[PDB]
Amino acid sequence: EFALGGRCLAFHGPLMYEAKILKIWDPSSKMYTSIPKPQKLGEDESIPEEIINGKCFFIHYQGWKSSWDEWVGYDRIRAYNEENIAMKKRLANEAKEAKKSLLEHHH
Numbered sequence: 001e002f003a004l005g006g007r008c009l010a011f012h013g014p015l016m017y018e019a020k021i022l023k024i025w026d027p028s029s030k031m032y033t034s035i036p037k038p039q040k041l042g043e044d045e046s047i048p049e050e051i052i053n054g055k056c057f058f059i060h061y062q063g064w065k066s067s068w069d070e071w072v073g074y075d076r077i078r079a080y081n082e083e084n085i086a087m088k089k090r091l092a093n094e095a096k097e098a099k100k101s102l103l104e105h106h107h
Contacts, residue, residue: 002057004035007080009088010059010072015095016088018080023058025071032058047071 002008002021009016023032025047031038041047047056051073059077060069078084 001079002077004033008057008059009078009080009084010061011076011078012061012068015091016078016084017064018062019059020062021057021059022069023071025052025056025058027053027055032056051075 002024004021004024006021008019008021010019011017023034025032026038029038031040048071051071054073054075056071056073057077058069058071060066078087
């Protein structure tokens with residue numbers, strides 16, 4: 001599952017990346033929890049209407065600047081586990097193979 005400060009994997013574009021959960025949104029109470037206590041969305045805060053009715057998570061991608069931080073739903077977020085890690089690796093290798101394929105047949 002997903003816990004505050006816990007690791008997770010998330011799609012950003014067609015590939016998956018490791019991230020850290022900083023906030024957990026509850027669609028019902030319209031309040032999220034945070035790591036240094038539920039609270040509503042602040043003056044300059046917001047969640048995409050595309051995912052706001054579901055459980056959302058505000059994540060920070062490991063090794064990326066915080067300006068990339070964002071809310072994601074069960075749409076793009078996945079549990080940090082062997083099966084999803086394998087999925088991550090598999091997509092990487094498929095793109096590696098796709099790259100190899102067209103780079104040759106390019107000319």
